[model samples]
Target: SGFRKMAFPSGKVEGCMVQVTCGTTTLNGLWLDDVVYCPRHVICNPNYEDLLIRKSNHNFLVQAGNVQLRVIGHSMQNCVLKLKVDTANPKTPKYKFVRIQPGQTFSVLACYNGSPSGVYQCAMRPNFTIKGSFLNGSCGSVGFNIDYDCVSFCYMHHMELPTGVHAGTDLEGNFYGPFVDRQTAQAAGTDTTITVNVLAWLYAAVINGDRWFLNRFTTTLNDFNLVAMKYNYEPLTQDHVDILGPLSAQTGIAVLDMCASLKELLQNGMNGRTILGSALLEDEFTPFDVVRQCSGVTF
Candidate 1:
């Protein structure tokens, strides 16, 4: 049989019960498709592949409800500078273009045009040319910075509800932010599941004396997540009930009973520690984990 070609794109090889032969060396592994075999001493560096794009020198500051865009010592040539707000409205991003000169500074609203404050990751890319065309010159790009008025835990849900809270962490370490109010949340790109869950967490935190949770929501609610200078409450679903059942047990809070009133209060737009006072009057019910053993209607 003639020799078969084998190639590993990123130097990763995996196989089972097969023999690989290259000159005097023979290795055993399973068959991999579309492999391009490379000769010994051929080294390829993945990092060295893309070299045309250059880094940008823009720094951002978000304070007092504004995004300060500053170019520290501008570029060598005239370029079309593009700024994108990628955190809150990634699907329909807001863009700003400025013709920047050497040592120039520009500012835009964190939400742009009196919009709600959510978590915002703003980035800049400058397309310039020595030859006056993109085909001839490179694009200078700056990495994104979390540009927002609120803390890292807050995101803007809408123009009306500029500041909002972010719940559970994603695998990429990105948190979910939902608009505090119904109007803003219904706008777009809102993760209702996260919003509802976080609200329950806030309520449970207040009841269970989770200082860490209490502090974060308190701070974030004041600084961001604001609706009429107060945090807004959202409705709960069956899924929220399921999560809070275990979560309350872990936090020394009785889920089914306390959250029953919680669900009712949330429906009426009441939130935070003040609303939790009534629920705490009842003695803590049996923990859900233990209750599962002696399963019943309560469980």
Candidate 2:
């Protein structure tokens, strides 16, 4: 059916029902035509239609490593079946064309290496194109000009916590933990202790690909000694005399290099405009004191 372009007042078209019929067959479904009214806008009809080709028992052959799209030619004779392996990308989709025999089963082989999850589509007619879900080890629906609505065990790609970090997941499976240690609440005492904690956290962020945490660590590390000295306490621990100079120097350089590496990864790997959408800074939030002049520290 075509889109009903008639405008109705607010609450005027509520609870309206529409049925679908293809020739003599009245499909077993009622479509609700939702009507919305606003100050400058109103939407009424959702155009629904029935196509010539109907999808049947479409299943994944886990052992054969293929997809079997079972379609029946309802009305059209000598219909063409065009298979798209990856339907997410329309500009450069992998294509295969086959002349569909009327009222017969047609199975197309779609195999690709990488993540098991993807989308495949089989278009029977020029106007009857529909998409289906594809999984490496699971089943997905393949539809043609129809609406309908699976899981596979796969390894999740993310870094695990390091040793001594002491992290925990909640009942909802969200991970939470502190990056630093506790020693009678005196563990964060000296500059050396702060520096070591800073390095451990930095390493942890790098391993986890978490630039937001890296930025936080960089900001804290750059401000550690400055804050300590302002309070009249010696920043660096007595055992490693004047450790601030070397630590600051190394961390500054390391953070800049790390940011560059992450920038490349964000620009290339996922083609993202910015890393984590500006929640992560370009230099991992490295402060000016550690980055500037020979007077600050020695690398």
Candidate 3:
């Protein structure tokens, strides 16, 4: 299917339904055809196809909407974890993706973003075989894990929160809570986002006089303070401490991703590996912040 060439308001395409076949699997899922986009949407169907259920054998991976995607090997639970972003990225990135060639045993670092969709097709996970993707603005974040042979029309990549339990979300509809304390939280850190419950428990733990958790929560403030001093800058040399001098380079990147970030890595040169949170998402929101943004009150 092709996109409607006429540029129309996204509101005009409400409840629109379309489907296609992917790698011998035919199913009715959300049609990701042109539903209005923010200047970036035109690329969605540049390949002359709806770009949904794209030609594969070069499947890609995506980590969207405050989710942490830790890429590891398949050893039936015998494999030790492998990751770069989990260790490298100071803040959990809201979006990251990588292209995987077929039969290709890929890793997390390779899950980079900004690649041609058709040539680098995607939709696959160890748990369920992902077939296609939801384009940006077609859903919430422009990233998705199309599986169950079931794709949706307006997949939000956003989840529905249930009352009394803010386990957060699993990219599905619910987020799980870490038992308690920093060690368990660290263990729970990989491949997941934090919930208000996690923060609330940590508040209790910090109140109970846990220094590490104190630093863990305090780090957020520390980061804020670091930013407050200089606000934002790059090429930070080691001489000045005018409240803006970074403690390290990552600090520079922290603010770098804050605004007008490296969609093209500052427009010089960009590879798939360089884009996804390489600087950390400046506007990155967490489950706790979701309500803050999702809330009716504006800050």
Candidate 4:
């Protein structure tokens, strides 16, 4: 056969049985990936190839396929950033937690791309829950130094978005989500399942235009829908909102208030995204700010 083209399953990482050649080198590299797994390192500065997602200038962590995720500054307000991974044991699906402080850099020898998840704690205000991987940052990206919010995690993709972002599925049931961060909806075409973060979807579908999202396959966001506000649905409680809210951008600020508030948040709602820190709680969580830290600052 001369030169032929081939395609593999959307997210499968299969080993090449035979020898292969690429870019002056003849070796086997099983495919999509990242990391800094050094067996015995004396002097090592392993270059993190795929910058999956750069979620924030303040908050940090979260990636698929053991990615090398990064967090910047400005949004940093000294609060710690926690990155959660589901060690997924078939029976109960145990999860693991990792935390990185403001502006501090760290590495996960493996950003385990396993499954299984459950809700948790960080702020009693909006003690929320998020899926795949969870992100906890009490930093203020909302308006000022507010804290307690919902969620947004992982930097395992090539696309970057603004705050109050949300995603959706079309007639194809093709996944287009997260509005925040997700692995399933990888741009590679794994868009079948459904994952929601209420606030984001609302912001996107409402403020932006569902017709707009149906095509972009890119995303809007908030809290209450997932947790405290108790809009509807039980499975989605406690999504993402940083710091509590009365004024949480993610809360009364991040997701939506009116055409005016949405307009005030971002010129074109879908143009940016927002996450919450808190909603209907003591911590007053609101992302966008907290989420904005987690929200606007993402990759």
Candidate 5:
């Protein structure tokens, strides 16, 4: 009997359940589609098979299942580098391939073919020479000592950026520098969403404590857009490891991480059925709670 595909009210059911017997895997990169298809999926090493997005590296905690880690560089083509992990072990894989390009930083993440909790981070390369070096020596590329500045910029949101922050590159891609303060963000007056969308072009770190600023705005103020910055990439420096690292580390929650935190808060609030005691207060207080809950880094 021929198989029939079905779509549900929620969406199309994923294809992972249909076990394909073909050995010659289709060569096109599969992470992009799988991630969007399955939402959060996990594929462990060895048993996992999929195409990788070039020019991107990664480090992910296996919230569930496992995935094979792969890295293919410019010179290293048509070859697969594999790493294995046991989800039942002491630590899941910490680092995967982190690819950085010259123009826009690029990164890619694919959830497992079927697993429900898979996430992949991808960066794009830019055109100009990226300014600054890594504060944390080791960011992308296994042996190479990553430039400190490549990973992040000084906390600009704390001060008022005259021209606002310029876009910078990272492993995933180029991103616009966020406005330095809520006031400036507010004064930017509604078009910030355009800037927010452009942030994918610059994969710079999330502005510290800026999630509140992100939350303060709505679609009219600033549409909440999701952007990826490689967290595995870090700037290495004595000051970074000691002074800057600790200080910056305190503010180091990536935009993606903050989004997760906010998601949890929103979920919990809804679960409690408090129904936003006061609708207006809920709008204000909810964001405050998101920022407060987003205060720490994920351990």
Candidate 6:
């Protein structure tokens, strides 16, 4: 089938199906297509023909969501995995695909935003032996073929979380800069946007203290104190005992992820990572503090 173009707001397309045919009689599986939806959905399709059932050599291996794909290999099986993207306009390149032996697993990097939203399928083997469930969303849906009970472990790769400084504060801790302003956030978004999306939940999870994040943040450190905190830049040669210095670099990132307490964040090793407490001039929620502006929050 040809690439189908759809809009981002379309939500999801149900009952979207494709037919595959095999070229070789004993082929493992042919690469059919790769599908991706904006906001992060990636999929791979294998060529499965009706004649595959009659053939003795055939298998299917492909994954959707976090579920691992399963394929049964026979004496003669043609293997191929095809990928495609669903967007308003199909690009010149349909999709990027990979080929591996039956039972071989493929790992996809976290997808960035602007892909598409839809379900994608792949043939189990060239001979139409089996078909795998297509990916429904970037990280939410799962598709599997064979080993019915083993398919429960599928999941999507969202963004990675902030590191150093307040690792304990959970995702809710507010992060300060590294960034000087919105302009910087936009510039960094060129590379970080995808990372942000995959980790957004993790970012959100921080403040709310998802079971794992909070446990780590709070348990590691003792408590917060002003004597231990500072804000302002100092000259390497300056000898002012009370001299203040600029906030730690990771401070902005910490706040962005939503950690609530300075003590909890310190426990996570932010002081070493240069991500620690700051003299926040602006309150993030109210947009009055320097930390909020320095860290650069864009929506």
Q: Which candidate wins on TM-score? A: 1
- Model number with the top lDDT: 1
At residue 139, candidate 6 shows an lDDT of: 26
Q: lDDT per model, in order?
A: 0.24, 0.22, 0.22, 0.22, 0.22, 0.22
Off by over 4 Å in 1: 1-195, 202-238, 252-256, 266-299
Model 2 lDDT at residue 98: 23
Better of 1 and 2 by lDDT: 1
For candidate 5, the per-residue lDDT at 283 reads 14
Q: How far is candidate 4 from the true structure (C-alpha RMSD, Å)?
A: 20.9
Residues 1-299 of candidate 6: C-alpha lDDT, one tens digit per residue: 11111111111111112222223211111112233211011112222444343443122223332332233332211221232322222212222222222211221211111233343332112111112222212222222211212211111221122221100000111111122201111111211111111122233223233324333232111112231233211111121111112221322333222323333443443333321122221111111112223344331
Return whichever of 2 and 6 wins on TM-score: 6
Against the true structure, what is each candidate's TM-score?
0.22, 0.15, 0.19, 0.19, 0.16, 0.18
Native RMSD of candidate 2 (Å): 25.1
Residue 82 of model 5, lDDT score: 24
- Per-residue lDDT for 247-276 in model 3, tens only? 113233222222122222223333343221
**Location of the lowest summed lDDT over 10 successive residues in candidate 1:** 128-137
- Runs in model 2 deviating more than 4 A are 1-194, 214-224, 228-299
